[PDB]
Structures are given as C-alpha cells and as structure tokens.
Design a protein around this nucleic acid. Sequence first.
RNA 1: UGACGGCUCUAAUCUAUUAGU
DNA 2: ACTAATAGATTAGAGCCGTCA
Lengths: 42, 448
Amino acid sequence: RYLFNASTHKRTYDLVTLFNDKIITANKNDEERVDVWFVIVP
Amino acid sequence: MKELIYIEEPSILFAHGQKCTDPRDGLALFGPLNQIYGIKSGVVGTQKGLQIFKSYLDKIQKPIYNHNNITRPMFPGFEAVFGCKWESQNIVFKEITDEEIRRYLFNASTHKRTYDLVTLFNDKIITANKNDEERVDVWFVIVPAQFHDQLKARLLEHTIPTQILRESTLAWRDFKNTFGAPIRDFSKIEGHLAWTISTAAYYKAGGKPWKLGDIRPGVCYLGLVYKKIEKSKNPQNACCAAQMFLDNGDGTVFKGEVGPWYNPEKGEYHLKPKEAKALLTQALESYKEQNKSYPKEVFIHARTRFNDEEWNAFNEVTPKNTNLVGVTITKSKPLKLYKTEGAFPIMRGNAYIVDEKKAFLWTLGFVPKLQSTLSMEVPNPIFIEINKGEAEIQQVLKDILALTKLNYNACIYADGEPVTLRFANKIGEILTASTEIKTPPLAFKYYI
RNA sequence: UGACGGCUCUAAUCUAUUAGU
DNA sequence: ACTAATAGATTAGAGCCGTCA
Ligand SMILES: [Mg+2]
C-alpha cells in the first residue's frame, strides 16, 4: 500500500528484492533461453 | 502355463500437434516442436581441434547414410531436419598453452594435475564470458579418469551451458592403433552419431524437441537414489532427489528438487527421519505455485526397500486426499525366457502378473518395425514391486512404460529403466565433486 | 566424455543363531 | 554388553567389448 516517503529504505528494498528474486528464479528455473530482460515500471 | 498380458506402446507428439511413435521419424518428417532462429558457438582447445571441428561441422550439413538404413534411418541434413542455422564462420576460440611441460599427466599426482587443469579451463572460460563483448551460447571442449567430473562442478555457480567431445570421436579416420586399424570404428553408426550430437546441441541451446501428450492431470512423479562418498567419517549422505513432472494448465516441466540431504550413518541406506520431511515440503510448493492447486495424487519411485517410520512421517507430512506409493525397480533377476521356435526373441511390452503387487515387465524386446532386437543377447526382464501404498496396479504397470522414451541425451527408441532414476544418478556424481556449492540451479541444461 | 546394452571381478551393511575370551 | 566365523538375502563400484553375422 502507501507508507509515505518515510521508510524509503524499506520502500526501495522490498521492490528491489522482489524484482531480483523474480529475475534470479527465472534465470535458474526455466528451460527457455533468454538474452535480454526489459523491465517495465509504472 | 500362464498368459502374459500385453500393453500397447504409448505415443509421443511432434510439430503441428500431431502424433507419432519414433522420435527419429518425427525429426526426419516434421522436425522439432519449438524453433530457435540460430545458435552461436564457441570453442576452446588446440588449433588442431579447431580445424577438426570445422571440418566435421561442414561435413554435417550434407546428408549421410547408414550400413542398413532400416535399422537406423538416414541423416538428411542438419538444416533439413531443423532449419536452425549453425555455421562454421561464427566461432570464437581461446588458445591454450601448448608447450605442456607437465606432459606426465597420466602418470603423476592425480589431485594436483586435475585441480590445475580444471582451474585453467574454468578460469579461461570465466574470463571469456566476463570480458569479451561477443555473445556465446554453448562451449565445446576438445582434449587429446576423474577428469570430466570436476569441469562442471565449479562452473555450476556461473550458470553456463557446457559440452565435452572426445578428440577421437570426430576424427576417428586417422585414430589408428599399433596394428593400424581404428580403435573405435564408426563406419556403421555415423548417421546415428549425427542424430545424437545434433539433438544434444539443439536441446542445450534452448530448444525442446518433443513433449508427451498422453498424460493425465493431477499427478506428480519423483525419484531417489544413493551414492557412496567417503571424506572424513564416511557420511553416506546422497539423497539426491530428481524429477517433478508437474502439469500446469498446459505444458511439461522438468525442474525437480535438488540438494544432498545427509544420512550420517554407515550402512543405513534408508532415509533419515529429519531429512524426510524437508524433501516433500520442498517438492509440494513448486507444483503448487505454478498450478495454483495442490497435487491430488502423487508418486514415489526408488531402488531400495525403505523402513516404516519414514513412511509414517511422510503420511503425517502428506496433505489430505493424497496417496503415497513407493515403486521399487530391480534389474538383476534371472527370468530368462525363450521363444519356442526360430532364432528370434520375445516382443517388448509383455507384462507378467504373479500376485496383487509384484510384477515382471519387459522393455528390451524387438520393435515390430526395427526388424531386430535392441538387446545383443536374449534380454532379461525387470522386476516391479509396490512396497507400501494402495492404488490400482494395472495403471501403474502401463504408466511406467510411458516414461521409457524421454531420454534427451540420445535418440534411441527406448531405454530400459525410466529416465527419472537416470536423471537422479546423473545429478549424483556431478553434484558431489565440490562440497562448497550452495543453492544449486534447477535446470537440466548445465550438467547433462 | 556418444550412447546403449551385455558381461567380468571386488567390496559392504541388516537380520537370527552358534562357538568365545 | 563387544569382540571372531558360516550361511540367506540386498546392494554399489569399476572395467571390457561390441554396435546387431
Ligand atoms: Mg552425454
């Protein structure tokens, strides 16, 4: 949800952990070979 | 004086969503399922390896024949079967030291020489991957024994596909002996060699040749195996699980659960009580999150009878409405049969039921269309037993045969044992080379 | 390590008992 | 309460050799 500009450390850490774990799991789990990853952020 | 029940052979799928039996027929007729626009290679070794590999690669593009094409279909051409571009004008090459002062490798200190050579190769590959701008997909290694084991173990951390080919495999023409004859004559199975290398290269580049389409939903397959290791106190750890075979709304999956759970005892090949829970706990959620639902029915394969307390612990661990069955497969059981007439053996797919649980099954019987038998001599059966669990015997007997053709490392018509145990065994010896590996990857590409 | 199969020798724990200091 | 010697019956490594007359 919205936690204001405060807790900005947690604010960036949560999102970056989510994206990083998603990318790492995709790289180490899926079978199809990929070359580039285009990240779309709102 | 008992009738033997015959089970019809299952079928596989190919391009355009159509069915067939032999993978080679589908390849020569419809090719692969998914398509990759091409592959970019990369080679390491000596310049002799470079010229030999280039010569062989340009030899592949033209069709080749077999001694008796009915026994083995002909190879029509790499681009014909696949249409995937693979040329000999896009190869990168990193030179190796060639003076080779340590020419005494085969008769010297094994550990030091192996560590030095594997360090050299791995460091060169890492430097090439982390420095050069040009992209790479696979790597072929040519070398002129506890040797190939360490090569993949250290590189497993960096998630890079790899392949190794013997120096005598490609240029077998001049590989003569003291008599002068080739030591590994390949004058009859060159087409099948091309088949095997081409399919291995296509898979390891990210292409999926074929998938099953005669499977039922709500089922999961699993297997376990044990291997011997002695470092300090002989901890018979093993317990290297494999296979998941889950089914989402559409598709096949071969991730599996990996990690060497430890059995500290000496001869207790039976699983530890503490480690048992973690295996099923790590197996369940992988299917759950992909398919959004729990697996109603599950399967367990093995190769050794296990005690009761592990089964109990699994029973409390397993969720509601899930049946647990442990299927034991044995290969060394003398049940030599004989066809009454002719110089010719029995078919494949014949099953013999002795009781409610135990059974004898054949896989190495002649194909009706191959005009010959896979086994060199009269084949021997395999024994199937159900230790614990309640289910229908007939569907289990027919279902194992469906998993006798998913061998991606080769293009044989079928393999005796189901490839689940083969995958687990293959993971075993390659994951135990180095004990410093943490969180191993969950893909079959890197170590096959 | 091309991959499969058929073989050939070597080793080892778990039962249940005996002889044994 | 553990140390040797005979069996039945499981259970795992390695090493050769052919490739379907
Ligand atoms: Mg291989």
